[PDB]
């Protein structure tokens, strides 16, 4: 049933439960490092295979506790040379494998807290298999999710103005990854080498909600203070006020499409499909 | 009625039959070689049209024997200065057009042998129209599909271990293409010049199956001997043992995603959506 | 049509032909036309700078490479529409390169 993901004394059991006929575990095997000749005087190419393969695990599952969800995010985001070890409950896999969060990806872990769905968190994990003996690095960086015990609304603070996000249709998604870690080819052996880098990670909070009342004021406050201002080196304080057990984070909306106001025919309200924030420098 | 593809003495008839409202023939007309000006001081661009156009044929049909399917694969893959002639049974086209396999494409021909069907092969052909008098080349390479008369399972041999692919849900797809041939613009002809190159081609076998019993052993044997080993200059021997009338081919899994193990909730078995093999040098 | 294929009175004369439109560059090597040209660049420039041309062709079994020894005469002619050919560049080969 459960899959165990562990690093030293930290251990997270992931139920690996899903509905109907959904894909719980995908394992992709590859040879990214085969040289297949693009040309040559043969009908069929010459090849050479000289390096480590690729094995990728994609785990879909659910968590029954928000506390465990934060532990999983912390575990995935943490830089440490102590092996991240995965135990899979299926006979085709060895009892433990050494893993890196997905090699090049900004999105190794997705945690969804959907509307309704009390004490159900949707988990998607991408993991790359690495050599147990070839985990290399200098720095430890322990990732901490800020946690508090309140009830209050999700609050967005920028330039002394605070905006309370509507509870109506509220969904939260968190995305975590380590794109600055190197997973590197090695000759003569099966699995690649993991270079753990005490460097910048990906940590993103996405909100979806429906703005039902005080529509101009609510939307204008967010747009005027976040989108139409320059925020400088600082950003936005994103405070969960204890929803999902979460606390206060410093973030900024990034890119072309972090926020959308959607108006639909025959509806008296505004839909926000996404409001997307990336966590910025805050540790001292 | 029925579409003929021929090259000198060799001729293959493709029924051009499909179910219901499916596309049997697509002909695209293009002017890829027009220069439309990206800038300039007018509202509308100046243009120049000074070269041959594109005509592409996409043919879909079904073949009623495996032997003809192998002849079609051989006909498409062969390097020859003899014009490949296409006869289309529809009045909007001339009786014969001279063709090349799709101009820069890995997949000119797709042959599918789906599970649960006997003597019924899905054909997809992409062909580029070329000038009948401008088929230019020096080299000559007769392609041969290895054929034999057995009943035996599909066998993957690597490092002295033979793995028999499960018969259950077993579906086979072959893609063939000639991407190293050059189709080139000509000043004042309607159609381009075909440079036939005695150079490396595309030939790929894709398998899908359900692994039902001896599940760890079957999958592990494949992944141990093929994916977690360095195959060198050699590769896998892929032997059909007379299934579809096919014989023994030398191949290698290429790239980041050639093999996938899929586990679905509530199921006591493993799905393989893809096991993908590219044919390698052995045609000496 | 071509001569020999028209039964007299059966076909319109010259058909299916039409007037030339577009730009054509022809390359003449030692008095012979090169068939398989697909790009031409010609530079004509004041005294401090060298006038040069680059021709790009398709080749088979290195057959065209042999037509252009160093110092051989090359002429580039241009015609746009139905206008008569202008010799726009005369020069000599300094480099022949063939690559994959």
């Amino acid at each position: 049933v459960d899959a165990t993901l562990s690093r030293g004394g930290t251990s997270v059991d992931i139920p690996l439960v899903e509905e109907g006929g959904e894909i719980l575990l995908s394992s992709t095997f590859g040879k990214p490092e085969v040289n297949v000749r693009k040309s040559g005087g043969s009908l069929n190419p010459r090849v050479i295979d000289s390096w480590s393969g690729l094995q990728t695990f994609q785990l879909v599952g659910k968590l029954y506790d928000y506390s465990t969800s934060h532990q999983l995010a912390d575990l995935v985001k943490t830089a440490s040379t102590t092996p991240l070890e995965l135990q899979i409950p299926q006979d085709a896999y060895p009892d433990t494998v050494t893993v890196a969060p997905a090699a090049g990806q900004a999105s190794a872990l997705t945690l969804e807290y959907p509307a309704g769905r009390k004490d159900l968190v949707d988990v998607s994990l991408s993991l790359t298999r690495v050599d147990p003996n070839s985990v290399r690095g200098v720095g430890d960086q322990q990732a901490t999710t800020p946690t508090t015990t309140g009830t209050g609304p999700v609050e967005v603070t920028a330039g002394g103005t605070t905006v309370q996000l509507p509870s109506s249709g509220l969904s939260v998604e968190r995305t975590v990854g380590r794109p600055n870690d190197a997973v590197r080819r090695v000759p003569r052996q099966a699995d690649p080498r993991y270079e753990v880098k005490a460097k910048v990670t990906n940590d993103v909070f996405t909100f979806s909600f429906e703005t039902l009342d005080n529509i101009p004021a609510t939307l204008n406050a967010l747009t005027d203070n976040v989108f139409r201002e320059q925020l400088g080196r600082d950003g936005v304080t994103l405070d969960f006020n204890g929803l999902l057990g979460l606390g206060s984070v410093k973030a900024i909306p990034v890119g072309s499409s972090p926020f959308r106001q959607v108006h639909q025919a025959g509806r008296g309200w505004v839909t926000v499909p996404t409001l997307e924030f990336r966590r910025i420098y805050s540790n001292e | 009625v029925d579409a003929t593809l021929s090259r000198g003495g060799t001729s293959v008839d493709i029924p051009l039959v499909e179910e219901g409202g499916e596309i049997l023939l697509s002909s695209t007309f293009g002017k890829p070689e027009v220069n439309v000006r990206k800038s300039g001081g007018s509202l509308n661009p100046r243009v120049i049209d000074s070269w041959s156009g594109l005509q592409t044929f996409q043919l879909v049909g079904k073949l009623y024997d495996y032997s003809t399917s192998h002849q079609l694969a051989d006909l498409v893959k062969t390097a020859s200065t003899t014009p490949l002639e296409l006869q289309i049974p529809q009045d909007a086209y001339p009786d014969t057009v001279t063709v090349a396999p799709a101009a820069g494409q890995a997949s000119a021909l797709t042959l599918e042998y789906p599970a649960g069907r006997k003597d019924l092969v899905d054909v997809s052909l992409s062909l580029t129209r070329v000038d009948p008098n401008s088929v230019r080349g020096v080299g000559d390479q007769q392609a041969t599909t290895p054929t034999t008369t057995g009943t035996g399972p599909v066998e993957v041999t690597a490092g002295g271990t033979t793995v028999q692919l499960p018969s259950s849900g077993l579906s086979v797809e072959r893609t063939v293409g000639r991407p190293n041939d050059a189709v080139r613009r000509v000043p004042r002809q309607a159609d381009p010049r075909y440079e036939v190159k005695a150079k490396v081609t595309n030939d790929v076998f894709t398998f899908s199956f359900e692994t039902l019993d001896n599940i760890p052993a079957t999958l592990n044997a494949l992944t141990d001997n093929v994916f977690r080993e360095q195959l060198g200059r050699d590769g896998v021997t892929l032997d059909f043992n007379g299934l579809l009338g096919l014989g023994s081919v030398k191949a290698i899994p290429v790239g980041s995603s050639p093999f996938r193990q899929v586990h679905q909730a509530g199921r006591g078995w493993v799905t393989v959506p893809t096991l993908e093999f590219r044919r390698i040098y052995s045609n000496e | 049509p071509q001569l020999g294929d028209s039964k007299l009175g059966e076909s319109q004369l010259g058909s299916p032909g039409t007037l030339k439109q577009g730009v054509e560059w022809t390359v003449v090597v030692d008095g012979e036309e090169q068939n398989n040209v697909w790009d031409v660049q010609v530079v004509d420039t004041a005294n401090p700078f060298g006038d040069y041309a680059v021709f790009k062709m398709d080749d088979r079994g290195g057959q065209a490479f042999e037509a252009y020894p160093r110092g051989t005469r090359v002429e580039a002619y241009v015609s746009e529409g139905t206008e008569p050919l202008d010799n726009r560049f005369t020069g000599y080969v300094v480099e022949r390169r063939e690559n994959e």
Partner: peptide
């Protein structure tokens, strides 16, 4: 994957990518 005169100008950095979290 990019070429000048048919030679690749892409670096053979042996750095892996593996597909992101499904969502």
């Amino acid at each position: 994957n990019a070429t000048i005169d048919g030679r690749q100008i892409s670096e053979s950095t042996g750095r892996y990518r593996s597909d992101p979290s499904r969502r």
